[PDB]
Amino acid sequence: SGFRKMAFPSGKVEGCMVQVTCGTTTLNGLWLDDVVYCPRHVICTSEDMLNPNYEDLLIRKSNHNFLVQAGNVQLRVIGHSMQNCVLKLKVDTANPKTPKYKFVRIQPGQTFSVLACYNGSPSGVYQCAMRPNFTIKGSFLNGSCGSVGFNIDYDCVSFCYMHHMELPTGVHAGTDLEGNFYGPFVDRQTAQAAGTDTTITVNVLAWLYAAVINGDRWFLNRFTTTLNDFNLVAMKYNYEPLTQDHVDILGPLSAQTGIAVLDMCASLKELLQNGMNGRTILGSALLEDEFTPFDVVRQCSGVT
């Protein structure tokens, strides 16, 4: 019993972190096999960031200008290339701590763990969701760029995020490991609209099932609803519209608890319309949307 915002064990990712320095800029890189991946803005000076011509800035750099250090040891750079917003530095040594891995592009509403790093050294690990608007609400300071987001299925690390920047609003933006930004963001110091965010309905419902499993049941009611009626409420409260695909993904939790998905929707509808009335659910005084249905099943079953 108990339910926590749990991150994946970060060891397999810690073994991949390196420091990358180019000129005066230092950030983090991810060393997998014989390639080090890092944000391409490592080649910029603070002055270049207003509108960088990355192609031109990279033309002025050679392999020997990229200083890559894995803890105490220096890596020898034998190639460099830019792919979208990431640089790939080919090194002469395969990382001996390379775990089994994949590069994946996550969908908005999915969750992942972030290993925040500074100077190639891990500082902490936390779990977060990719917002529907493709931002993340992380905890990152200057020097954290190149820190990565990931999920782990048994012995395979699926890397889904590399941190690039903080928007003027304090929210975070980054790329997949092929350097493609999530969302409309560009790697420039410019005003960038993040766009309307919504609450991840399927995750709130999953977390309400997690609450029932762990004994917090006060919000259960005698009501039911339909997808159409619930979506009118979701619209008013800036929640993502619930679809049959979301209902299907909640099947295992509905089967375990015996609470039909639309009955849990009616509990959520009442909570949206009436608030918490000063009560809490799983130690929270708001409706939590950073746990997917898969996260709830994993945490409630003890998957390693």
Added chain:
Amino acid sequence: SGFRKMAFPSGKVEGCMVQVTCGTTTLNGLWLDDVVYCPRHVICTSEDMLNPNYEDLLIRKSNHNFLVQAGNVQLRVIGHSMQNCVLKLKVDTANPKTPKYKFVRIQPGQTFSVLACYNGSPSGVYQCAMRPNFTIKGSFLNGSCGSVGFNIDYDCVSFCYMHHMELPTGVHAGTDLEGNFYGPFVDRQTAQAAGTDTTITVNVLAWLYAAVINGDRWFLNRFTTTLNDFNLVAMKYNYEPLTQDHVDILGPLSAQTGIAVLDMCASLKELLQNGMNGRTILGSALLEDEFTPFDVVRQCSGVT
């Protein structure tokens, strides 16, 4: 910017986890140097748990009855001893992944990371506080016993908790690494009062400073208070009384923000008396007490 419930990177601890089996019971052990530490109730059957005579149960066990497996490899047990509520299994091989470590007994109100494990395999990592009543509000299922709590200062892991049991109320109890329970708990399947818990005032104040640093400032007011007046409010709301020692530990945050500790106390007093009025602070709709002043300084400065 941003503030998250951040755990320490768990890699150094993952390398110490092993599975311990005795008879029919399997739980986790912590392998440091040539000793494996685990909860002594690994020697019990479910029937023995109502009132186990651990000394008698252990007398029936020999070194070869403790099956210790580090991933795929089996460890050879050459000695066993019980120290308080832990068993120490001497093995013939020092763990090659033993980090620099210490065993510490944390104080109530302090925080630490938990690497939840099942069958010797890490499942996830989360940050939590040792409650003033010596329980932890963790996320643990059957098989998680032997999972550990720790803090990391540079390259040194300070182990402070080993998980032993879930109380009938769903809260968690465990020991330091010398096997001494935190709180009044005993390792028996009996009704055990946890005792009155309180909110960790110094941590709520630290988190309010974290909020101001990250831009959430709506709760700041034109008021001040005294330790005596604030403690009358703390008493009414079941908060720990604030002392000058707590004020001194908040010095660095008060110096960084320029907000005097008693002025932040007046913000906290108003929040206690008036509630949040449907607003949030650092994404929370309640007053968070699981960040110490040291945690806030560390997260706000990027300590690795």
